């Protein structure tokens, strides 16, 4: 009941996800698999619906079969009573969509050997941090988040579930130079979802009619995804995720961080950030 984190190979993880790593050594990847990789709260559920909808040929009826966590297995998941992501995985048919937030230090090597295709979504660190703070509150398996200010301090030293945002985004960027990785930016998806859905289609080697594409742009919108109980996580026990404290689908905005970040916090973050992202051509947008 709100246990602390357990560290493994330098990554802080939720108690259960760490345990789940045991059985996960048994996981065998297929060359037709597709891995969805992101640092938490960077748009995983967004791109999962996009991808599942593509995989279902656009049929919103086939997408309603089960919640997105039953449809896109969560590689390292485990909970009391709720079946592990590995358990779920036994029933999931090929081509499979898989989700993870594991850094490379922990990624099943099966996945890199099998040349598995990666769709990676990155989001600006300020928005991620805010999103993560609210998530910590509602997602009961997380430690106590404490105050925004303290939580932000942790976030800068990567002392939060899954560790440092900064390393996560650079390492998977680097990986994209020697591995098939489509590296997406949440803010581009905000800017122009259609442009971004087209690039995914191209990447996944599929082709769909203009009508179907536009149909997807809408059913993958924040507002549609908020109403859809197969994607908003409301079918889970309130003891596990308490939407009354904070909804999973909270705002879905680029730039909203500015209503949480104080000026002092903003100034300290920018200074810290310039150092951490020094020798990197990664370029983020904070707004619009
Ligand atoms: N279709 C969509 N369009 C835009 N944002 C979405 C979305 N579906 C979910 N989100 C937002 O993405 C974040 C969760 O990401 P993840 O899927 O990685 O956990 C939350 O951000 P906010 O808390 O900033 O609103 C959530 O509201």
Residues near 55 by beta carbon (within 8 Å), at least 6 away in sequence: 95, 97
β-bridge partners, 100: 37
- The values of phi and psi at residue 241, to 5°, are -130, 115
CA end-to-end span of the chain:
39
Fold of the CATH domain 1-288? Rossmann fold (3.40.50)
Residues 6+ apart with CB under 8 A from 50: 197, 200, 216, 220
**In 3D, which of 45, 257, 264 has the Cα closest to residue 130?**
257
**How far is ligand 1, taken at its centre, from the CA of residue 213, in Å?**
20
Tell me how far apart the alpha carbons of residues 5 and 143 are, in angstroms, rounded to a whole number: 7
Residue 36, H or E segment: strand 34-38
Distance 207 CA to ligand 1 centre (A): 26
**Experimental method used, please?**
X-ray
Which of 241, 252, 254, 255 best tests ligand 1's pocket when mutated (most atoms within 8 Å of CB)?
Answer: 252
Give ∠ CA 279-282-283 in degrees, rounded to 5.
120
Q: Is 45 assigned a ligand-binding role in the annotation?
A: yes
| Domain edges within the chain | 1-288
- The answer to whether residue 179 is catalytic is no
């Amino acid at each position: 009941s709100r246990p602390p984190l357990e560290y493994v190979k330098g990554v802080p993880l939720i108690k259960y996800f760490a345990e789940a790593l045991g059985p996960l050594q048994s996981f065998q990847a297929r060359p037709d698999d597709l891995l969805i990789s992101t640092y938490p709260k960077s748009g995983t559920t967004w791109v999962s619906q996009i991808l599942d909808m593509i995989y279902q040929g656009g049929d919103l009826e086939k997408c309603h079969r089960a919640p997105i966590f039953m449809r896109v297995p969560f590689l390292e998941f485990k909970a009391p009573g709720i079946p592990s992501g590995m358990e779920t995985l036994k029933d999931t048919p090929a081509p499979r969509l898989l989700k993870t937030h594991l850094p490379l230090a922990l990624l099943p090597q099966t996945l890199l050997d099998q040349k598995v295709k990666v769709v990676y979504v990155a989001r600006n660190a300020k928005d991620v941090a805010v999103s993560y703070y609210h998530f910590y509150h509602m997602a009961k398996v997380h430690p106590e988040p404490g105050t925004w200010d303290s939580f932000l301090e942790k976030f800068m030293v990567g002392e939060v579930s899954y560790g440092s945002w900064y390393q996560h985004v650079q390492e998977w960027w680097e990986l994209s130079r020697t591995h098939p990785v489509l590296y997406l930016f949440y803010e581009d998806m905000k800017e122009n979802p259609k442009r971004e859905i087209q690039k995914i289609l191209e990447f996944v080697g599929r082709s769909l009619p203009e009508e179907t594409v536009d149909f997807m742009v809408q059913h993958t919108s924040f507002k549609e995804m908020k109403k859809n109980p197969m994607t908003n996580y409301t079918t889970v026990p309130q003891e596990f995720m308490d939407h009354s404290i904070s909804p999973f689908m909270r705002k879905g905005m680029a730039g909203d961080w500015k209503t949480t970040f104080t000026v002092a916090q903003n100034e300290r973050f920018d200074a810290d950030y310039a150092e951490k992202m020094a020798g990197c051509s990664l370029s983020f947008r904070s707004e619009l």
